[PDB]
Design an enzyme around this catalytic site. Structure first.
Site, PDB file in Angstrom:
ATOM      1  CB  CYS A 107      -1.078   0.080   1.494  1.00  0.00           C
ATOM      2  SG  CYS A 107      -1.835   1.528   1.239  1.00  0.00           S
ATOM      3  NE  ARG A 110       2.606   0.803   3.363  1.00  0.00           N
ATOM      4  CZ  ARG A 110       3.973   0.155   3.480  1.00  0.00           C
ATOM      5  NH1 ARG A 110       4.255  -0.460   4.477  1.00  0.00           N
ATOM      6  NH2 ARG A 110       4.486   0.133   2.263  1.00  0.00           N
ATOM      7  CD1 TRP A 279      -7.043   8.922  -1.432  1.00  0.00           C
ATOM      8  CD2 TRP A 279      -7.866   9.114   0.592  1.00  0.00           C
ATOM      9  NE1 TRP A 279      -6.360   9.533  -0.777  1.00  0.00           N
ATOM     10  CE2 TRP A 279      -6.810   9.578   0.568  1.00  0.00           C
ATOM     11  CE3 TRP A 279      -8.752   9.311   1.710  1.00  0.00           C
ATOM     12  CZ2 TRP A 279      -6.295  10.206   1.761  1.00  0.00           C
ATOM     13  CZ3 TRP A 279      -8.253   9.577   2.668  1.00  0.00           C
ATOM     14  CH2 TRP A 279      -6.674  10.265   2.748  1.00  0.00           C
ATOM     15  CD  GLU A 284      -5.948   2.303  -6.661  1.00  0.00           C
ATOM     16  OE1 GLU A 284      -6.505   0.921  -6.553  1.00  0.00           O
ATOM     17  OE2 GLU A 284      -5.989   3.107  -5.799  1.00  0.00           O
TER      18      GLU A 284
HETATM   19  C1  HEM Z   1      -6.118   6.479   2.391  1.00  0.00           C
HETATM   20  C2  HEM Z   1      -5.807   6.632   0.959  1.00  0.00           C
HETATM   21  C3  HEM Z   1      -5.289   5.088   0.284  1.00  0.00           C
HETATM   22  C4  HEM Z   1      -4.496   5.136  -0.698  1.00  0.00           C
HETATM   23  C5  HEM Z   1      -4.451   6.400  -1.644  1.00  0.00           C
HETATM   24  C6  HEM Z   1      -4.265   3.832  -1.255  1.00  0.00           C
HETATM   25  C7  HEM Z   1      -3.547   3.130  -2.190  1.00  0.00           C
HETATM   26  C8  HEM Z   1      -3.294   1.990  -2.652  1.00  0.00           C
HETATM   27  C9  HEM Z   1      -3.098   1.573  -4.005  1.00  0.00           C
HETATM   28  C10 HEM Z   1      -2.894   2.321  -5.241  1.00  0.00           C
HETATM   29  C11 HEM Z   1      -2.964   0.206  -3.858  1.00  0.00           C
HETATM   30  C12 HEM Z   1      -3.046  -0.761  -4.761  1.00  0.00           C
HETATM   31  C13 HEM Z   1      -4.096  -1.452  -5.048  1.00  0.00           C
HETATM   32  C14 HEM Z   1      -4.436  -2.382  -6.155  1.00  0.00           C
HETATM   33  O1  HEM Z   1      -3.717  -2.338  -6.995  1.00  0.00           O
HETATM   34  O2  HEM Z   1      -5.149  -3.565  -6.056  1.00  0.00           O
HETATM   35  C15 HEM Z   1      -3.245  -0.162  -2.367  1.00  0.00           C
HETATM   36  C16 HEM Z   1      -3.060  -1.547  -1.686  1.00  0.00           C
HETATM   37  C17 HEM Z   1      -3.459  -1.936  -0.601  1.00  0.00           C
HETATM   38  N1  HEM Z   1      -3.962  -0.942   0.592  1.00  0.00           N
HETATM   39 FE1  HEM Z   1      -4.046   1.037   0.530  1.00  0.00          FE
HETATM   40  N2  HEM Z   1      -4.751   2.824  -0.087  1.00  0.00           N
HETATM   41  C18 HEM Z   1      -5.137   3.736   0.831  1.00  0.00           C
HETATM   42  C19 HEM Z   1      -5.624   3.268   2.202  1.00  0.00           C
HETATM   43  C20 HEM Z   1      -5.878   2.004   2.481  1.00  0.00           C
HETATM   44  C21 HEM Z   1      -6.513   1.558   3.851  1.00  0.00           C
HETATM   45  C22 HEM Z   1      -7.488   2.339   4.912  1.00  0.00           C
HETATM   46  C23 HEM Z   1      -6.066   0.390   4.207  1.00  0.00           C
HETATM   47  C24 HEM Z   1      -6.479  -0.593   5.438  1.00  0.00           C
HETATM   48  C25 HEM Z   1      -7.088  -0.264   6.469  1.00  0.00           C
HETATM   49  C26 HEM Z   1      -5.263   0.001   3.084  1.00  0.00           C
HETATM   50  C27 HEM Z   1      -4.544  -1.245   2.922  1.00  0.00           C
HETATM   51  C28 HEM Z   1      -4.264  -1.820   1.645  1.00  0.00           C
HETATM   52  C29 HEM Z   1      -3.743  -3.055   1.469  1.00  0.00           C
HETATM   53  C30 HEM Z   1      -3.753  -4.521   2.277  1.00  0.00           C
HETATM   54  C31 HEM Z   1      -3.371  -3.226   0.027  1.00  0.00           C
HETATM   55  C32 HEM Z   1      -2.684  -4.560  -0.692  1.00  0.00           C
HETATM   56  C33 HEM Z   1      -4.242  -4.991  -1.353  1.00  0.00           C
HETATM   57  C34 HEM Z   1      -3.942  -6.224  -1.969  1.00  0.00           C
HETATM   58  O3  HEM Z   1      -2.980  -6.802  -1.530  1.00  0.00           O
HETATM   59  O4  HEM Z   1      -4.943  -6.477  -3.110  1.00  0.00           O
HETATM   60  N3  HEM Z   1      -4.922   0.767   2.217  1.00  0.00           N
HETATM   61  N4  HEM Z   1      -3.443   0.986  -1.815  1.00  0.00           N
HETATM   62  C1  LIG Z   2      -7.814   0.486   0.502  1.00  0.00           C
HETATM   63  C2  LIG Z   2      -7.756   0.589  -1.044  1.00  0.00           C
HETATM   64  C3  LIG Z   2      -7.242   2.012  -1.456  1.00  0.00           C
HETATM   65  C4  LIG Z   2      -7.234   1.865  -2.965  1.00  0.00           C
HETATM   66  N1  LIG Z   2      -6.814   3.224  -3.214  1.00  0.00           N
HETATM   67  N2  LIG Z   2      -7.425   0.963  -3.632  1.00  0.00           N
HETATM   68  C5  LIG Z   2      -7.856  -0.100  -3.427  1.00  0.00           C
HETATM   69  C6  LIG Z   2      -8.252  -1.223  -4.318  1.00  0.00           C
HETATM   70  C7  LIG Z   2      -9.785  -1.124  -4.330  1.00  0.00           C
HETATM   71  C8  LIG Z   2     -10.243  -2.016  -5.650  1.00  0.00           C
HETATM   72  C9  LIG Z   2     -11.682  -1.630  -6.036  1.00  0.00           C
HETATM   73  N3  LIG Z   2     -12.141  -2.409  -6.852  1.00  0.00           N
HETATM   74  C10 LIG Z   2     -11.528  -3.334  -7.568  1.00  0.00           C
HETATM   75  C11 LIG Z   2     -10.299  -3.901  -7.306  1.00  0.00           C
HETATM   76  N4  LIG Z   2      -9.447  -4.714  -8.007  1.00  0.00           N
HETATM   77  C12 LIG Z   2      -8.932  -3.996  -9.256  1.00  0.00           C
HETATM   78  C13 LIG Z   2      -8.462  -5.490 -10.005  1.00  0.00           C
HETATM   79  N5  LIG Z   2      -7.498  -6.260  -9.252  1.00  0.00           N
HETATM   80  C14 LIG Z   2      -7.344  -7.620  -9.690  1.00  0.00           C
HETATM   81  C15 LIG Z   2      -8.049  -6.412  -7.787  1.00  0.00           C
HETATM   82  C16 LIG Z   2      -8.251  -5.136  -7.187  1.00  0.00           C
HETATM   83  C17 LIG Z   2      -9.537  -2.861  -6.090  1.00  0.00           C
HETATM   84  C18 LIG Z   2      -7.944  -0.478  -1.966  1.00  0.00           C
END
Ligand code: HEM
Ligand SMILES: Cc1cc(N)nc(CCc2cncc(N3CCN(C)CC3)c2)c1
Ligand code: HEM
Ligand SMILES: Cc1cc(N)nc(CCc2cncc(N3CCN(C)CC3)c2)c1
Ligand SMILES: C[C@H](O)[C@H](O)[C@H]1CNc2nc(N)[nH]c(=O)c2N1
Ligand SMILES: C[C@H](O)[C@H](O)[C@H]1CNc2nc(N)[nH]c(=O)c2N1
Ligand SMILES: [Zn+2]
Lengths: 408, 413
Positions: A107, A110, A279, A284
């Site tokens: 993420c 953070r 957000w 994305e």
């Molecule tokens: C507040 C603004 C936030 C932004 C701008 C942000 C941004 C991102 C982005 C761009 C990704 C890549 C997502 C993808 O390609 O699937 C990501 C992944 C992730 N985020 Fe954040 N995020 C935010 C908030 C959070 C919050 C609130 C949490 C948890 C409470 C979190 C936990 C995670 C986790 C665990 C992943 C990995 C997801 C996965 O393994 O598929 N994020 N984040």
């Molecule tokens: C906490 C959080 C923050 C953020 N900026 N993006 C996300 C991913 C949210 C999300 C919404 N819809 C679809 C997906 N997919 C896209 C396709 N991908 C394979 C899995 C994640 C992910 C999560």
């Protein structure tokens, strides 16, 4: 060993001491690195984990070894003895959720980690209950465009049999429809899931952007369908600032990104249902969702309207169209007063965050593969940032898809 | 360790199965507890360290020519063994050398161009004794590889290391690069990345033109001696002035680049033998010039100046002016190169070619090590197939390796 990470643009070196605290695995070994692989309890296993987490809790509030610290350890053991588990205090729930976010190597957002609204849904017993908790989450977090980070936490796993699971991988996603002619309506990555909802009684409006209903499993039971009230679902129409023909492409997207398929782990307890949301970073939607071949796949269409030479790949026509598409998405969200971050600002924020973490924590696990934006990579500062990856607890982990495990 | 490891392509659902990782020799830097996937870089060998390494390589060679266990194989083994025992080292046959170098390339997990791995002109310079000799060989390399614009992959291998006090080294990190000069006022002129090396050259006697694209001389070390300066004949150095198919103003930026990408600071390791000077070259992927050389802040940093002539809003960031200018720059780079009939490959083609190559390597060789962090282009990553490709990274031998910079280790005579 203390480990040093370099940034090759600024020549800044940071020293990682934090990695010595990690205990989970990464999947790599000394001879094989799996940096690009997406996915690599009993009374007895459960206590030391519990001991560990409480230890870092009372460590983080400057009361290590304190009276309160001791009785908590006392509470936990007696409780693990006579129920084969134990329940987290409130303060402990909040800390653990914030820290799993803080530890999430993938993420880029953070910097925001400590500003997280935690909803305790541990008193939930039914899918109706869940729907309620989720709706409130969605409304709180959406906040009419001014997005706020939140997490909602349902009862911990007990025996595997009686698990709580939000079935949808995200709270808000579009339906995907298999067409007789081989093509596909809407989001192709969701067709199987969409088919499970139709198979459950969902009357699908066969559109391009249909919000899938919620599929909620409570206490091990059959999942139940719930349509989220449309007034709570904030979508944005995508238009372009210079290209007035872009709104004709008919693209919208939801504003609230909320992951709901992950499992939150705290002191050896498993929270298999913990939808969380922040957000959107522009890319994305702009790059992945819209332009992945396996997704909405709009590049070719957009490149047509832009009148680009699409004969040879070396005109970089795909690149051009991709950039304009992402300009649109940012412009729309910004114009609608919907919180969004562009990948330049988000990555900057991350390097600043990372500097902070080393300064006060002695490290910051990070997965370069996930952190680097899917476009314009080397013009963002994280491309040049060496990152160490490793697994600290509390954490978010993947779990099986529910439809591959559940019996009816 | 597990015998079959599976990798997945998330765009195409294609799952491949790697067996080759079992033959992994060296360390990656990673452990079970920590991953160094994104870390850039994570007196000689003895008789008893060399016997096993030599055999491993020889066995592998005779396995490739379908002559394993043959008379010639066992005779080669006995000859090498007896050679290490009487001389503490051994000499590769020309066929062995050629096999070793092609295989070091094939194994180069950071190289997206490996589909060409088997087409590599190998120049055997093991008979070289002086820096002048080195210069002669390198010029001949440059000319052959440049081929009037139709580049051909080549490597020149200078004598293997003996005691560590007699190394042959090319001091330039790459055969052809532009100078960087620090000004009193803190501003850099030319390529800021090469300031340190440009100063070394100037100190060693180079008279610097002090321009933006001055081609650095070769600084060459033969037999552990102090290095000597040579200017590559300018007629051998093919260059490409950057213009744009649409923006007539682009040529006003005074940009050009060299045609030939040639790494010269790496160590080539074959059967336990170390070739500390083994300049090799291929052809360019646009993004290398267009994105890194031109748009990195620590390099030529032209983004802002291209952004101003494009007339973009440069006050926000969510205008994505940087991104727009970046695409255009790379269109100009691919255009100028194609227009001068100089071999270059765009990142779309290159990455697609790598996927085909990878798949074929899994099919015939049971794996293909790859460093995702390097393989994925520095722009438009998600829209090239490699991005979605799971890769396993591990170090096979023969290989190319990094080595200390010679000015940090050299003992001045
Ligand atoms: C507040 C603004 C936030 C932004 C701008 C942000 C941004 C991102 C982005 C761009 C990704 C890549 C997502 C993808 O390609 O699937 C990501 C992944 C992730 N985020 Fe954040 N995020 C935010 C908030 C959070 C919050 C609130 C949490 C948890 C409470 C979190 C936990 C995670 C986790 C665990 C992943 C990995 C997801 C996965 O393994 O598929 N994020 N984040
Ligand atoms: C906490 C959080 C923050 C953020 N900026 N993006 C996300 C991913 C949210 C999300 C919404 N819809 C679809 C997906 N997919 C896209 C396709 N991908 C394979 C899995 C994640 C992910 C999560
Ligand atoms: C034939 C055309 C070739 C293409 C298109 C190509 C492509 C690339 C690219 C884009 C890189 C990354 C360069 C950088 O970011 O600095 C690279 C790296 C590399 N290539 Fe290839 N290459 C080619 C030929 C070769 C040859 C002939 C060899 C060796 C015999 C080779 C071995 C390597 C090695 C060892 C690296 C890692 C460089 C480093 O560690 O700095 N490549 N290649
Ligand atoms: C065989 C080969 C093929 C290819 N396409 N590129 C290369 C790299 C060539 C190259 C030329 N000039 C400079 C560099 N530098 C760029 C900056 N980088 C930090 C180190 C390498 C690299 C080598
Ligand atoms: C920090 C990171 O390892 C480093 O900046 C890498 C990223 N990937 C790269 N990929 C290539 N081809 N060339 C590079 O120089 C780099 N730099
Ligand atoms: C195979 C590879 O790990 C896969 O394409 C990864 C690469 N990096 C990513 N980075 C982000 N942010 N999101 C992703 O889904 C992926 N996918
Ligand atoms: Zn690793």
């Amino acid at each position: 060993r203390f480990l040093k990470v370099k940034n090759w643009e600024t020549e800044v070196v940071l020293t990682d001491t934090l990695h010595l605290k990690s205990t989970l695995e990464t999947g790599c070994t000394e001879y094989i690195c799996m940096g690009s692989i997406m996915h690599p309890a009993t009374k007895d296993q459960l206590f030391p984990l519990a001991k560990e987490f409480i230890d870092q809790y009372y460590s983080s509030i400057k009361r290590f070894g304190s009276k309160a610290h001791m009785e908590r350890l006392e509470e936990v053991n007696k409780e693990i003895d006579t129920t084969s588990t134990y329940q987290l205090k409130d303060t402990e729930l909040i800390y653990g959720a914030k820290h799993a976010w803080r530890n999430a190597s993938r993420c880029v957002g953070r910097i925001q980690w400590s500003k997280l609204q935690v909803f305790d849904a541990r008193d939930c017993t039914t899918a109706h209950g869940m729907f309620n908790y989720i709706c409130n989450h969605v409304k709180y977090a959406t906040n009419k465009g001014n997005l706020r980070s939140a997490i909602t936490i349902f009862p911990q796993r007990t025996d595997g049999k009686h698990d709580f699971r939000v079935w949808n991988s995200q709270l808000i996603r579009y339906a995907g429809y298999k067409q007789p002619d081989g093509s596909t309506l809407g989001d192709p990555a969701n067709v199987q899931f969409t088919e499970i909802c139709i198979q459950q009684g969902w009357k699908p409006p066969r559109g391009r952007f249909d919000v899938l209903p919620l599929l909620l499993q409570a206490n091990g039971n059959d999942p139940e369908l719930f349509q989220i009230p449309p007034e709570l679902v904030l979508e944005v129409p995508i238009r372009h600032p210079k290209f007035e023909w872009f709104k004709d492409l008919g693209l919208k997207w939801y504003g609230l990104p909320a992951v709901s398929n992950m499992l939150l782990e705290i002191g050896g307890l498993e929270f298999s249902a913990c939808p969380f949301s922040g957000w959107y970073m522009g890319t994305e939607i702009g790059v992945r969702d819209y332009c992945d071949n396996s997704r909405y796949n709009i590049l070719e269409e957009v490149a047509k309207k832009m009148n680009l030479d699409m004969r040879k790949t070396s005109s970089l026509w795909k690149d051009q169209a991709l950039v304009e598409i992402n300009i649109a998405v940012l412009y729309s969200f910004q114009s609608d007063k919907v919180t969004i971050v562009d990948h330049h600002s988000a990555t900057e924020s991350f390097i600043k965050h990372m500097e902070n973490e080393y300064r006060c924590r002695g490290g910051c696990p990070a997965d370069w593969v996930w952190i680097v934006p899917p476009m314009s990579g080397s013009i963002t500062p994280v491309f040049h940032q060496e990152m160490l990856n490793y697994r600290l607890t509390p954490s978010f982990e993947y779990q099986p898809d529910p439809w591959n495990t559940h019996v009816w």
